[PDB]
């Protein structure tokens, strides 16, 4: 699962 921004 890509992390597009920060880990959420």
């Amino acid at each position: 699962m890509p992390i597009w921004k920060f880990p959420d």
Partner: antibody
Amino acid sequence: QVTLKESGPGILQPSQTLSLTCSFSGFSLSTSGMGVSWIRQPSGKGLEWLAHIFWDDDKRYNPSLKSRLTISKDTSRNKVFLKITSVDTADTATYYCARRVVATDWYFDVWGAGTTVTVCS
Amino acid sequence: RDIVLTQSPASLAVSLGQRATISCRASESVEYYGTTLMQWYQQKPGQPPKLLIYAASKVESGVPARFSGSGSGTDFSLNIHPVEEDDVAMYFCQQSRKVPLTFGAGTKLELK
């Protein structure tokens, strides 16, 4: 290759605004998943993250410094900017910018060499 | 609140050919759904920091096989063996689990 270069005023009197510029080449900050952080190493201390700006102009700040910081970008000139208001001796540091590209992990893959700013006494 | 990274030693004087180990302890877990958001960087004077290790144990391209990363949860270590002249540098850890991003305070690796 990908290069990042920080530039600044070199010296700055206290209470003035610090304006830093990260000039980059080899990629576009408009590409989906790109982002750039500003980081600093104060004199005699460890590194400290300041702010990060994503390809879609989403901005994140260090909560301890948020009220003093403004990150921004101009992708037409391949530049990222940082403004720090009301500087004092605690802002004397080498300032770095670094890129992060979307992945399943989260890491800076390329850094600049840094620019040193001295806040005058 | 913030994840504090405690990196030791501050200074490492090593003999050429020996093993050097650098330690990072986090104030809380840096794990995130099957990945560990802990990085190691090398920095030479006047040069950009270079990524060595990401996700605790993955080696970045162009990094010598003398470098390895290990650890889980809160305890991480960087291992250099054998130490060579090119390894004289500043090293630091970095976590990406929570904002603000935070860094270890650094290890200066010098030769005796």
